């Protein structure tokens, strides 16, 4: 009835909505109304898949978050420590997914609104990667406090540096799509050093049977595949116009984020059972 609109082709878009020239049709027009943007969630356009991937994913980690947070304290060795450390992971996860599906909804509002939620969606990715190291580094170096605090300092200065760069207007431009890929991929590349440290500090066999050696492989693959699909727009690059709505590169990257954070939680969980289990106690 009120607030009607129709999708427009790529050529009649403003400059701040031309982020992917391989998506030819199905774009929402510039609508400076939040009521129209939130109602577009239930309509078909180029952002429908991007919205629902992290809208549903935010519920997945809102459920996983308050389930782990409300686990009875008589099951943790240090309830205050282990929950605050786990809280940083779900906090960065809820912030990342919320700042993302909100960005992809109000993406067609105006230039100021898109510019604002773009920096939040970028900073949310860094918050997730930073928050992912907090539980992983806690149990990996449960008996070695020196590398546990040193690696926390490095991840902090690397993630804050990424957030600082994310606040630059030329960072979000289409010409720096490979740059945005390399930044948050290099942020995950930092975790290779503590992964090898934990492998040589413990037994090389323990790095496989205890916890998951495939954790690093599953994570590194989803990091590489996520960055590659994002920086190259693989599904649409081959056949532009055939992936305007579904199975575009940004959608597969959205799912890989939820899947990788899901694997990391499942990895830290079994990494936790080893720390307060025998043969996993502190040694010299």
């Amino acid at each position, epitope marked *: 009835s009120e607030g009607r609109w129709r999708v427009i082709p790529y050529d009649v878009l403003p400059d701040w909505l031309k982020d992917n020239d391989y998506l030819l049709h199905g774009h929402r027009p510039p609508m*400076p109304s939040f009521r129209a943007c939130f109602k577009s969630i239930f309509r078909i356009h180029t952002e429908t898949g991007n919205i629902w991937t992290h809208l549903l994913g935010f519920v997945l980690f809102l459920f996983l978050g308050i389930l782990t947070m409300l686990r009875p304290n008589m099951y943790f060795m240090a309830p205050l420590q282990e929950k605050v450390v786990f809280g940083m992971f779900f906090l960065g996860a809820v912030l990342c997914l919320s700042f993302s599906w909100l960005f992809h909804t109000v993406y067609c509002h105006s230039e100021k609104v898109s510019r604002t939620f773009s920096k939040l969606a970028y900073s949310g990715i860094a918050l997730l990667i930073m928050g992912s190291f907090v539980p992983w580094l806690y149990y990996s170096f449960y008996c070695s406090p020196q590398p546990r605090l040193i690696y926390l300092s490095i991840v902090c200065v690397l993630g804050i540096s990424a957030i600082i760069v994310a606040q630059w207007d030329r960072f979000a431009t289409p010409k720096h799509r490979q740059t945005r890929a390399g930044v948050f991929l290099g942020l995950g590349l930092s975790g290779v050093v503590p992964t090898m440290h934990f492998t040589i500090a413990e037994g090389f066999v323990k790095a496989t049977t205890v916890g998951q050696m495939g954790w690093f492989f599953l994570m590194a693959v989803m990091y590489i595949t996520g960055a590659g699909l994002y920086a190259a727009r693989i599904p649409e690059r081959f056949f532009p116009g055939k992936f305007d709505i579904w199975f575009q590169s940004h959608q597969i990257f959205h799912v890989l984020v939820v899947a990788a954070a899901f694997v990391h939680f499942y990895g830290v969980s079994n990494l936790q059972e080893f720390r307060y289990g025998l043969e996993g106690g502190c040694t010299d």
Partner: antibody
Amino acid sequence: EVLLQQSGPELVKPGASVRITCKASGYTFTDFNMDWVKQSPGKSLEWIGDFNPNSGGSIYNQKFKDKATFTVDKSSSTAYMELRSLTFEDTAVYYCARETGTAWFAYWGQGTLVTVSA
Amino acid sequence: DIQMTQSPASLSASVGETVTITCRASGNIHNFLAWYQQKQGKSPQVLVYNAKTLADGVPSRFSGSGSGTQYSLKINSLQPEDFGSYYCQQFWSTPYTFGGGTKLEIN
């Protein structure tokens, strides 16, 4: 470039009908909606309705529900408006305007003056 | 039916001065407003759409502002060729409606 060419001026006696043409070119005709505006001489613009050529739907202004009728010819990228039972109050210039997602008109036709006299 | 109301109606100014045309809507239209300039005997041309977005090719002197129910169209330096008729329209409500119009004279 995008151009909207309309039919020539109309001079008809009262009680007759007329059909106004809007020939579109320079874009995919089915991608946008086409509206119709009425401007009486010395008066302001009146929105008659819009038309979706892709789906065939049309939403009329209740002031013109028994006055105008929208038609299309996708094979020629052309739109039509049909005014019936013309009186002196219908003597005006009728425009066809194209939308761009939302109903803000960046392209207008040159106008078709329909004059009703006796 | 959301009805628009233009305040100036008949505007007169000199060359170089700043003028403003306001357009008050009866109901909220959520910045779905467009401004048009019409010359004598010719079709109108859009100046500002979506309340503030300047249309392509329009001089920088034309500015759009407002929110909710009150909106404005400001002209920085009035030019001798800016005379004509100016209209505001809303494309939020089901029956789209234009304003009363504002004739602009240059002395």
